[PDB]
Structure 1
Amino acid sequence: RWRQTWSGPGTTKRFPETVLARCVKYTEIHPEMRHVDCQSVWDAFKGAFISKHPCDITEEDYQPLMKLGTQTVPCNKILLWSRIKDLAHQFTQVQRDMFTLEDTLLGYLADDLTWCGEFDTSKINYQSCPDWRKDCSNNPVSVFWKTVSRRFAEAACDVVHVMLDGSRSKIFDKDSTFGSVQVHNLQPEKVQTLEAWVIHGGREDSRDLCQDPTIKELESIISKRNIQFSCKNIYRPDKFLQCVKNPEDSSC
């Protein structure tokens, strides 16, 4: 076929098999998630979007999945990120210094995957899925991520960290999931400080990007919520990762 329904990529090939194998892998590795039955997890995931108009998905559709994937994360060890997923994950890989959402069962199941169904049909749509901008925002992927990102922000306490891409037009973007959802769902009764790490993509020296207009916006939004704001430049992401792997000795 030469003309698809939606303007975005279709469900990832072997989506059922992949979600299930990820659930097996995760539950075998993480002892706290040993009680999880993976078929019922798959079934709840499936029940959220199958037979449903892929432009009419709600947070409620994902409630059975949220329940089965319930998980305690150390509240003071949360790492948020925005436009810098690779470094965030390489970082938390080193010695579980922290957790990203993709280190939870639910985030781990869905990471890098696309999925949608069809109204009045129980088929998975492997040909196309709604683009969140071109088509509609209430689609299975977008709704999933909004819901889990929010619950993950709500679980944080004490010092929360966020990695930001210092080479973006807007280092902090109000229209990102981080800026539109997570910053507004950090709980001021629990969260003492939001500390931003601004990751330089820029060669060598470079500016004090903690002074960037968008970082000041972030500071201002967070301060008006009664949460403290902290910022640090990461001038050389290569040296940072090395220092995390091997603290001191090296000129860290």
Structure 2
Amino acid sequence: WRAEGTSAHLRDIFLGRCAEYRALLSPEQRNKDCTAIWEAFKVALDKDPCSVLPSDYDLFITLSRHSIPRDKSLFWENSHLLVNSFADNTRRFMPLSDVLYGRVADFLSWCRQKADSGLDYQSCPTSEDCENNPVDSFWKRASIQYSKDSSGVIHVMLNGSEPTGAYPIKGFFADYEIPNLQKEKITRIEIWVMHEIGGPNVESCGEGSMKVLEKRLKDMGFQYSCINDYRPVKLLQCVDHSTHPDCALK
């Protein structure tokens, strides 16, 4: 397998994240069974590492699903760490990694061994090895739910320093989230194209892949907007480059 093996102490990490997250929930939605949720998630670790389908996690989602505040969704591509830091544990926004079912598996890996009941800690199948692997199917399933339950002002953070452009036509956002957005409960979509401090400006709003994205969104009939280096986020990137001119304050 050409990808990371399952995360060590997966169960403990999972249950822990689940426990801590419950605190961030509203008492009316606070009653979540972390053991049951782990139990349903665990089903994929009992199948062939190349035979797990998104729907296999339907029960898992059912047990952990909860509502997302209006205007709090934050989608993204190529900006994982910045999104988590900016989202600041649901304080500012609530990206998929700050929603119960996304929180418990964020950055982790998992998969059973090819011909054995045990978990493979050596490596796990990538999309190339086989399409229906545990981790991908998990995220496809989780992305869909996240898209379906999102409402109001939709935010999206893209990387304008990514060599392949800010918008991947075959990414999770393009294949599993844009299609699952309930247009009826979405007021508008606002893109933030971020660039590395002094970093390369491969694409900015309205250029290259961003034209492809914008077209699709408008075609689908969405009020749309785009901001290069959205300030709050730029300020956060700047924390690590205080002396750089782009970060100098008045």
**Deviation string, structure 1 residues 88-129 (Cα, Å, up to 9, x no partner):** 122121872321001111111000100011467432222221
1:192 maps to 187
The CA RMSD measured in Å over matched residues stands at 2.7
| Aligned partner of 1:122 among 117, 125, 131 | 117
Paired with 1:161 and 1:42, the residues of 2 have a C-alpha distance of 30
Between 1:141-150 and 1:20-29, the stretch displaced more is 20-29
1:53 maps to 48
| Aligned partner of 1:219 among 214, 222, 228 | 214
1:147 maps to 141
| Aligned partner of 2:40 among 41, 44, 49 | 44
Structure 1 unaligned blocks of 5 or more:
1-5, 244-249
| Aligned-pair CA distance for 1:46 | 0.6
Paired with 1:183 and 1:22, the residues of 2 have a C-alpha distance of 28
| Aligned-pair CA distance for 1:158 | 2.3
1:246 maps to none
| Aligned partner of 1:82 among 73, 77, 91 | 77
8 Å CA contact 2:73–2:154 kept in 1: the answer is yes
Paired with 2:107 and 2:45, the residues of 1 have a C-alpha distance of 19
Q: 1:226 to 1:121 in 2, by over 3 A?
A: same
2:175 maps to 180
8 Å CA contact 2:49–2:133 kept in 1: the answer is yes
8 Å CA contact 2:168–2:174 kept in 1: the answer is yes
Paired with 1:217 and 1:39, the residues of 2 have a C-alpha distance of 43
| Aligned-pair CA distance for 1:206 | 5.9
Alignment identity in percent? 35
Q: 1:43 to 1:58 in 2, by over 3 A?
A: same
1:247 maps to none
Q: 1:115 to 1:236 in 2, by over 3 A?
A: same
Paired with 2:98 and 2:55, the residues of 1 have a C-alpha distance of 23
The TM-score normalised by the length of structure 2 is 0.86
Aligned partner of 1:147: which letter?
Answer: R
| Aligned partner of 1:35 among 31, 35, 40 | 31
Paired with 2:61 and 2:16, the residues of 1 have a C-alpha distance of 19
Between 1:187-196 and 1:230-239, the stretch displaced more is 230-239
1:240 partner SS: helix
Structure 2 unaligned blocks of 5 or more:
239-247
| Aligned partner of 1:113 among 108, 112, 121 | 108
8 Å CA contact 1:69–1:105 kept in 2: the answer is yes
Q: How many residues align?
A: 240
